[model samples]
Target: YTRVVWCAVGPEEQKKCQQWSQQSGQNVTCATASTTDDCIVLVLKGEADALNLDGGYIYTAGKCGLVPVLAENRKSSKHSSLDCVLRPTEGYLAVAVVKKANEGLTWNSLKDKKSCHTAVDRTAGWNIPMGLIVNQTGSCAFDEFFSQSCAPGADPKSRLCALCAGDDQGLDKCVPNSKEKYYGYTGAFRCLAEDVGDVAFVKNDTVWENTNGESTADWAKNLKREDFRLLCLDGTRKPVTEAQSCHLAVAPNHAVVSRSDRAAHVEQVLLHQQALFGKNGKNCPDKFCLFKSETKNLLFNDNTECLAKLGGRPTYEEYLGTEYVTAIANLKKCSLEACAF
Candidate 1:
């Protein structure tokens, strides 16, 4: 009769957790926090059992004694008959995107340009892009590399928050939550689309999912896919479809993390809960769908097919992979103050 307590990162995710809690048939419950760090602290103190996290946060949680329990699996780029839970996770393609009209910009010439990032601790938006910059420039002052940016989670008064547009009321200008207009994948892409930033650091899927009217949001309703281009490491630009060859780095998929002692119970409850509410769960599309949120990406990525079991009980380091872990470590070593996790 064990129950799992899920930690929710923000109010929006908290609301989603409440719905999941209700649909979990009493097997799960919720503990809400203002940020992911707070949520991690809750799990550390035994106030919560588990929550999903990006690889960067996974590293932090792992350092604090938490273990990655399951990974978020999304639709594959290619056809596959393997069950979502049984297939190995594929890395997200991290790329630098720019408007086709910004003709002279390239990866080699990104200095002093206005930039957009999902957030400070995210993989594609922060770690991969900034890590490469620090390594290439041989400098730890990444904050000064960009003329201005919308990197949420940075100091509100810093240049990093200069391009960020807050909620309708203009409050919480640079908060790491969705309240900031330029915060996640969609937001960073929007920053480029709106001409607020010269370049955006996001994953390839983001471009395909939002451009050419793929998304109906006011800011993206008329975006043309052909008008955007991906920047390659060799200083050339290519169509978004060429991302597999023009990417900055491949990022590990997001995953669920919990205190080591609670990992087993949490995983058991999650598997059962998803069976009732996952993408093709018995009650999904009729009762509740655990992975759908009307584009909000709350609690889980809206594209998540299921919370797949790990390849064994790999430690967070093993799950994140050595190359990515080393990149993050190098970036943190350079920007110790900004990367203090």
Candidate 2:
């Protein structure tokens, strides 16, 4: 079997890749990983072949000799360019949300509230918000502010996991594994809904989908948009739809990436599969769905409209334009020595 390492962060993505392998008659088997940094290591070590990464993770992958093979064309108006050629794309905004009833909570006075996050170092949840926190507080003591936060990749014993239920009693509860249940955008929102977190930092779209009850999931089944509010910088709370004036950060478009030498091979397989399952493909708009058809974005990003060639691999700096990279850089500079990844 020809194995194609599908650098996924969890079981859902791994399952998709595995199924794709079976459908392709095992022409391409897959290797699974749990994180962007993990996937980069695997690809560089010749264990994995490629990954579909967010612009932030793409930057990390580029540093490890990987290159982008496809730029996702999302259904939106926002796009972030590094050195890659144009492909259609839309961006997501990151914001902090609190229950509308939490009258005492505001962006400026969040000093001891319980919190929820997408993940440690994730552009929206950590880098953007924490970067601003460092600027505001002049310290890396987020633990001191949030009181208890359930950031997926944090140290097991750290305050970041204090609010994590980690599969209830298993040590996996606070573990970063998707097995923990509450680990992603939805999970963080679930945290806030369940009262485990007084504030949730997640993408605005995810929050909207839930609060509007577009999903039937238990935690979000009856959630209403008016139930929550976005926390703005000036210590004011606004409706989620008012994101243009109430977001923490607007993130870059996500892309599919691979090792520089493997770009052509990866693209070849992607082209074949896309022709079979992409936006305009026969199986899609109906069967064998991949793009946000369900509650998960298993192997790729949500709201993806299509994938387009970047012409070639791009450097981290070149792919993540100066503005986006610099924003991330500013965040890192504030807490550089504090993180290992």
Candidate 3:
């Protein structure tokens, strides 16, 4: 079996012939032109299998393949020494001015270009068909290996997932509690997705206050004060000073509510005051606090206490199940006292 190899030549004619003979392939040899004059000479040399010339000298090469490895800009002209390698055995490749033809020259153009020795437009318009070149016909095994490695889907594990980082500066880390989450320093806030039944109060102080008075601050300074305590049914209380604890505040009776549940209740209150408050009675459209009462077991043992007063104990499920009957009854009882404040 005969071996096929590619070689490159510089500005000198003697060096060009020497490199051309060294390549194993009879049909192809790589050549370069230092100037437009040298480029015209390479076009004349039938031994010149492939030619590398500057974008400006492309017209002199009589339709040699055009490969633009550099950025398309005037600044790229400064790098005149860089040379792209091409094999000689391959036929003629399409040659178009990189500045003019958006479609790039492909390896096939090199094979076809040598055969035609004339300029032919393969790329109608659009992007250039630039790619790698390899000698396959002469060396069948090497060609098969090259093709397999270059073909798409040859390596299943090569797939990748793009890395994306979220901006924590505007995020909130909410825990299960009655209070809204707040990042006071960074001004980020997030409310709990679901009610965890923990009693807490959000204060109207600067820490909890929105930028404008309507929405809650991005973050609430963790309820460190002693007066802010978790109200429990057993008359037991815990201070809200712990990191895991949040401050809870009552939503005023006439406070405007957001139209969409997904909208940040505090954000809507802060950013869109006019839209939040119309003629609709403080705009309590979505029942934000009332929903909190239902989802969260704020009144967990209230019904049992009431039943105790009536000389009976309610079943555990009646107090803890999905229906949350005990919680509802307790909330109703507390509405007159606790919720009123």
Candidate 4:
């Protein structure tokens, strides 16, 4: 008999895998591991079957012989989960946005403005915008870009922390760890909302999820998508929904990956599981939701509406493509460790 195992990539993900195991009733089981580093060894030893990966992790996993099987498909509130599977899977556009009144600013004139970031090296918040900024300024000394900024995980001594309001305890200020108060998508938006920063670097959904009482948090409680506008490369402004035509880079989303031979089993089991507990699943009505995360993404991304097909298992290079990979490398080369910023 063929034995199947599902690898939960993060410590939090194992819980979901356990839940699925209890509910699926298949011969399927889990071999849980934490982080990309742990899964690589476990999968090779046959103790784990798969791991879902994001950008660099995807490349690292693939270089070790794993393949991509499922791609996360995010949908807007205006659309339902049913529409996600039939459409072409695509990446989200990264953008820089400011209050609609910042009429004098262009990507070129963006120097010395206050800035908010989801985190260092994130597709929208770091790699795309910062990559282009390096091309323009010719160095990692982007303390030249923003007068004061809040970049989570930035080294404490660096100018990146010039604007960061550390956590209540003030322990890990500017550390890349989540101990910082302003460290994620919502946090970045919160920074921009409170007038702490002039520009916010975030994905499309950041605004939609937090504005006009959609979120009751103190900062986001007052935000409205109408009050913001995207800052384009050509120096024009547009609504967030127009990011496809007017924004920064469009990078790949998260993907499910497994060792090449194990991909078939992983894909097969996930397809069945998706049918039962994915977005809008009949089993998901307030009982046990597969996608909702209290703090962060676990087995799957929280906003992901579906994990659609990929035709065949793909290599990391094929999944991320050449241009995006080069862009990522540029960010790394300019990072403080690569060169003294």
Leading candidate by TM-score? 1
TM-score for each prediction? 0.95, 0.87, 0.15, 0.77
Clashes of each: 0, 7, 30, 2
For residues 1-341, could you state the per-residue lDDT of candidate 1 as single tens digits?
67999998767778888888898776889998877888988988999999999888898888888999999999885647888888889978999999999998999899999999999989999999999898889899999999999999999999999999988899989887777888888889989999999999999989987877678888888989899999999989999999999999888999999989988888888888888999888999997898987665788888899999999789988999999888877888764223223
In model 4, which runs have C-alpha deviations exceeding 4 angstroms? Answer: 1-51, 63-66, 76-87, 101-103, 162-180, 294-299, 335-341
Which candidate's lDDT is highest?
1
Cα error, residue 208 of model 2, in Å, equals 2.1
- lDDT (C-alpha) at residue 298 in model 2: 67
Q: Give the TM-score of candidate 4.
A: 0.77
Model 3 residue 161 CA deviation (Å) reads 53
Model 1 stretches astray by more than 4 angstroms: 77-79, 336-341
Task: Rank the candidate models, highest lDDT first.
Answer: 1, 2, 4, 3
Off by over 4 Å in 2: 1-3, 77-87, 168-171, 285-287, 311-313, 333-341
Ranking by TM-score: 1, 2, 4, 3
lDDT of 4 by residue, 53-149 (tens): 6655565566667778888888744435446665557787777877866676667677888898876766677777888888888878866678878
lDDT (Cα, tens digit) per residue for candidate 3, span 143-201: 12111111111122211000001124422122111121221111111211011111111
Error of 1 at 186 (Å): 1.5
Task: Score candidate 3 by TM-score against the native.
Answer: 0.15
